[PDB]
Amino acid sequence: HWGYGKHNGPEHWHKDFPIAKGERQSPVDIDTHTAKYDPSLKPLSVSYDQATSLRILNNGHAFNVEFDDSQDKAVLKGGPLDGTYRLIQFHFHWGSLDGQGSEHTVDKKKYAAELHLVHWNTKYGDFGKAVQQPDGLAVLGIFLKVGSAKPGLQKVVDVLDSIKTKGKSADFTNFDPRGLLPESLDYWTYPGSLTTPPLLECVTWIVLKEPISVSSEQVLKFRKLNFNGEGEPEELMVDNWRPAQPLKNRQIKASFK
């Protein structure tokens, strides 16, 4: 009832999910000329040394690399955040062409893909409770451009053949998400939403300025995934991004000058 096709894509989502037209929807365009440096942001803290990946799942819209979130093992703190946010999963959005695929844009520039590392605020006890709160989630967004390969992505790429179709999962232990980060942690932040239904307005977005580079061959393997289930007509999983939404009564703050 929702997807990225010709008849169920983002422009239709409001019928089942009326917050699609809400006040704090994501993604947005980041205008680097109007985002203002905020010297109050605290330092941002990514603590992934104890991360425990478990599984990778094709959910029919993207693939999720899932983590054990039953202890503070991989946590995000600092920056704009109060308290501790635990990593639950990461996933990507990507294009059919290298000139599109990201959800956020920077001065209207679209990147080839965008990585979302999803974390929930431990004060709410579990993810399902957290998404009901305005400060329930913190999503670290990282742009991907096509150039050199990202060595830390290759283990993800190589398992995709085993999860080609919707509903397939595979064991995916011992994956280190630190290998997906750029050098700099400079970021923009603003209050927003999930970018897929139910589109809940529960996210503090933290979008890194520095993209990571992936190779053409790595992105091509993302584009071999399928939206459909096994034994259904093949529909390539491409262009699984929501376009920028109105900023409305929000300000984007920068961590850097």
Active site residues: 61
Cβ 234 to Zn ion shortest distance, Å: 23
Please tell me whether 116 is known to bind a ligand: yes
Nearer to Zn ion, 194 or 249 (CB): 194
> How far apart are the C-alpha atoms of 147 and 179, rounded to whole Å?
16
- 48 near 74, Cβ under 8 Å? yes
> How far apart are the C-alpha atoms of 209 and 190, rounded to whole Å?
14
Nearer to Zn ion, 145 or 231 (CB): 145
Nearest Cα to Cα of residue 169 among 89, 92, 54? 54
Please tell me whether 91 is known to bind a ligand: yes
Cβ 233 to Zn ion shortest distance, Å: 25
Tell me phi and psi for residue 151, to 5 degrees.
-60, -35
- Closest-by-Cβ residue to Zn ion is 116
Cβ 103 to Zn ion shortest distance, Å: 7
Nearest Cα to Cα of residue 242 among 60, 35, 28? 28
Please tell me whether 32 is known to bind a ligand: no
Cβ 33 to Zn ion shortest distance, Å: 26
With H, G, I as helix, E, B as strand and everything else as coil, classify residue 112: coil
Asked if 209 touches Zn ion (CB under 5 A), the answer is no
The residue length of the chain stands at 257
Q: What is the footprint of Zn ion within residues 111-130 (CB under 5 A)?
A: 116
- 89 near 80, Cβ under 8 Å? no
Cβ 93 to Zn ion shortest distance, Å: 6
Please tell me whether 196 is known to bind a ligand: yes
Please tell me whether 104 is known to bind a ligand: no
Asked if 168 touches Zn ion (CB under 5 A), the answer is no
Nearer to Zn ion, 146 or 207 (CB): 207
Nearer to Zn ion, 116 or 209 (CB): 116
Binding mask 15-34 for Zn ion (x = CB under 5 A): --------------------
Nearer to Zn ion, 104 or 116 (CB): 116
> How far apart are the C-alpha atoms of 130 and 186, rounded to whole Å?
26
User: What is the total count of residues that contact Zn ion (CB under 5 A)?
Assistant: 1
Asked if 221 touches Zn ion (CB under 5 A), the answer is no
Residue environment code for 184-201, b if the CB has 16+ CB neighbours within 10 A, otherwise e: ebebbbbbbbbbbbebbb
What string of DSSP letters covers 203-238? EEEEEESSPEEE-HHHHHHHTT-BSSPTTS---B--
- 87 near 58, Cβ under 8 Å? no
Asked if 104 touches Zn ion (CB under 5 A), the answer is no
Binding residue numbers for Zn(2+): 91, 93, 116
Question: Where along the sequence are the contacts to Zn ion (CB under 5 A)?
Answer: 116
Binding residue numbers for substrate: 195-196
Binding residue numbers: 91, 93, 116, 195-196
